[PDB]
Design a protein around this motif. Structure first.
Motif, PDB file in Angstrom:
ATOM      1  N   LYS A  29     -85.880  26.356  63.727  1.00  0.00           N
ATOM      2  CA  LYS A  29     -85.716  27.306  62.620  1.00  0.00           C
ATOM      3  C   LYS A  29     -84.505  28.243  62.836  1.00  0.00           C
ATOM      4  O   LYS A  29     -83.721  28.451  61.902  1.00  0.00           O
ATOM      5  N   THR A  30     -84.332  28.785  64.058  1.00  0.00           N
ATOM      6  CA  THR A  30     -83.194  29.659  64.366  1.00  0.00           C
ATOM      7  C   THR A  30     -81.911  28.842  64.452  1.00  0.00           C
ATOM      8  O   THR A  30     -80.868  29.333  64.024  1.00  0.00           O
ATOM      9  N   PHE A  31     -81.978  27.599  64.993  1.00  0.00           N
ATOM     10  CA  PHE A  31     -80.803  26.744  65.086  1.00  0.00           C
ATOM     11  C   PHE A  31     -80.328  26.301  63.697  1.00  0.00           C
ATOM     12  O   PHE A  31     -79.126  26.305  63.458  1.00  0.00           O
ATOM     13  N   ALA A  32     -81.256  26.009  62.763  1.00  0.00           N
ATOM     14  CA  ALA A  32     -80.964  25.605  61.375  1.00  0.00           C
ATOM     15  C   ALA A  32     -79.893  24.502  61.306  1.00  0.00           C
ATOM     16  O   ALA A  32     -78.860  24.630  60.639  1.00  0.00           O
ATOM     17  N   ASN A  33     -80.138  23.441  62.049  1.00  0.00           N
ATOM     18  CA  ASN A  33     -79.293  22.266  62.127  1.00  0.00           C
ATOM     19  C   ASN A  33     -80.176  21.031  61.841  1.00  0.00           C
ATOM     20  O   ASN A  33     -81.217  20.837  62.478  1.00  0.00           O
ATOM     21  N   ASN A  34     -79.766  20.224  60.858  1.00  0.00           N
ATOM     22  CA  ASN A  34     -80.496  19.031  60.437  1.00  0.00           C
ATOM     23  C   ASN A  34     -80.597  17.979  61.527  1.00  0.00           C
ATOM     24  O   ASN A  34     -81.668  17.403  61.698  1.00  0.00           O
ATOM     25  N   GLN A  35     -79.512  17.737  62.280  1.00  0.00           N
ATOM     26  CA  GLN A  35     -79.525  16.761  63.372  1.00  0.00           C
ATOM     27  C   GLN A  35     -80.475  17.178  64.506  1.00  0.00           C
ATOM     28  O   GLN A  35     -81.184  16.321  65.051  1.00  0.00           O
ATOM     29  N   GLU A 121     -73.165  23.903  72.879  1.00  0.00           N
ATOM     30  CA  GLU A 121     -73.259  24.885  73.950  1.00  0.00           C
ATOM     31  C   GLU A 121     -74.434  25.808  73.737  1.00  0.00           C
ATOM     32  O   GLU A 121     -74.743  26.608  74.625  1.00  0.00           O
ATOM     33  N   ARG A 122     -75.083  25.719  72.562  1.00  0.00           N
ATOM     34  CA  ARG A 122     -76.208  26.591  72.208  1.00  0.00           C
ATOM     35  C   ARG A 122     -77.391  26.402  73.145  1.00  0.00           C
ATOM     36  O   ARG A 122     -77.660  25.266  73.559  1.00  0.00           O
ATOM     37  N   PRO A 123     -78.109  27.490  73.503  1.00  0.00           N
ATOM     38  CA  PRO A 123     -79.274  27.323  74.393  1.00  0.00           C
ATOM     39  C   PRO A 123     -80.348  26.386  73.821  1.00  0.00           C
ATOM     40  O   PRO A 123     -80.972  25.646  74.591  1.00  0.00           O
ATOM     41  N   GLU A 124     -80.533  26.391  72.467  1.00  0.00           N
ATOM     42  CA  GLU A 124     -81.513  25.550  71.756  1.00  0.00           C
ATOM     43  C   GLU A 124     -81.202  24.092  72.016  1.00  0.00           C
ATOM     44  O   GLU A 124     -82.117  23.320  72.320  1.00  0.00           O
ATOM     45  N   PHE A 125     -79.890  23.730  71.915  1.00  0.00           N
ATOM     46  CA  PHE A 125     -79.368  22.368  72.124  1.00  0.00           C
ATOM     47  C   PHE A 125     -79.684  21.878  73.532  1.00  0.00           C
ATOM     48  O   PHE A 125     -80.270  20.804  73.694  1.00  0.00           O
TER      49      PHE A 125
END
Lengths: 227, 229
Positions: A29-35, A121-125
């Motif tokens: 939800k915070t990342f808001a990236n479809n992939q 580089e995002r922590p979520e990734f």
């Protein structure tokens, strides 16, 4: 936090599953990236595959052990029956592993589609990537596919500060030990035997250093076993 | 009818059977009052005890191994390896117990062989103990899949009194001959014996059927048709 490290590095259980996926869905939800969303969907399906199978195996074993079988009178009959049951379990475990690794492979493929270097580089990734690789290592380890865990473990320790994780070094040591033993057991070359023994010892020593500290009674002991 | 009693004799020993057998045999020993019979009975009982102790030990060992926690066993391959180790421990104990039990059974038969008086060898007490020793020996070999080894012991068994009229003796002989026939087929080795094992299997299969269902019954007529086809 050694207890939390150890808790991540095992076959999935109900409590861990619920905590992992609640946290990952919040990050999605915070990342808001479809992939990322699609990678998470595939990762969850892979863990589900594993959990369902491990529940099926426990249930199948319970049912087979609780049966009376008054017509099974001889030792050789019980041996034959247990061999059949083990073959059923193995076939189901292999099927579940293949399906789970296909979902993990698809999760990686979706993360591969995130091309933006800032997003990568995002922590979520990095958290989802780590989870996918760890589950993949564990699914292979469970079925004794230790050589197959080596490239996955190598990718895993490259992420963030994952090299500072003692379980990653513990599983790498174990996998290299298996390879060393495979060389000893087959008509394998000596250059390979020594390579695998060395790598086993490097990771065994690093795992020890990581959880007990350098120049501790445990680090000094493992140095002596290697010598 | 007494078919249930016939079937009850032909299995691995249990405590129901042990209690009945040795109470009856000790009573016969008193009436027979023969030293060699006494020694044969002593050896036979030691052989059955070996089996009883082992079958009790296996149950207890399996219970203890299944009740252990093993928090360090996390993986499927670990549980498989552990169960394979436990099964080897059980197998080694079972083979050792069978080996020891057959040595006691061999000594029992050897003591009855020392009774040289033909009148004493015709006694019902003598034939009963001999039958019990041979039967236990057959069952202990059959339990470990040593089916060819049961053949000479079953052939000696059916020679005694009216032992040829009991259907389980023919059932086990048919099974043992079948195993031999299949062993020849599987190993593709000297085939000049194949027809002999197959014939003997069929003779005992037919006789077992005749014994429990009767001649010209639906079951006897069926078995005749399978042998001809």
């Amino acid at each position: 936090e050694i207890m939390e490290q150890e808790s991540l590095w095992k076959n999935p259980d109900f409590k861990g599953y619920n905590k992992t996926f609640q946290e990952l869905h919040q990050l999605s939800k915070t990342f808001a990236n479809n992939q990322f969303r699609l990678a998470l969907s595939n990762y969850q399906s892979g863990v589900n595959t594993i959990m369902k199978n491990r529940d099926w195996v426990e249930q199948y074993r319970k049912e087979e052990a609780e049966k009376k079988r008054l017509d099974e009178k001889w030792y050789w009959q019980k041996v034959d029956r247990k061999a059949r049951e083990e073959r059923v379990v193995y076939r189901e475990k292999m099927k579940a592993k293949q399906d789970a690794l296909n979902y993990f492979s698809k999760a990686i493929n979706h993360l591969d589609e995130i091309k933006n270097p800032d997003l990568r580089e995002r922590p979520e990734f990095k958290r989802l990537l780590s989870d996918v690789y760890r589950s993949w290592i564990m699914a292979e380890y469970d079925l004794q596919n230790l050589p197959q865990t080596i490239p996955i473990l190598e990718l895993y320790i490259e992420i963030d500060d994952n090299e500072k994780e003692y379980p990653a070094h513990k599983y790498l040591a174990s996998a290299y030990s298996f390879e060393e033993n495979m060389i000893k057991k087959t008509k394998g070359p000596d250059d390979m035997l020594f390579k695998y023994r060395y790598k086993k010892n490097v990771h065994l020593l690093r795992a020890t250093e990581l959880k007990y500290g350098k120049d501790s009674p445990e680090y000094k002991h493992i140095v002596n076993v290697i010598n």
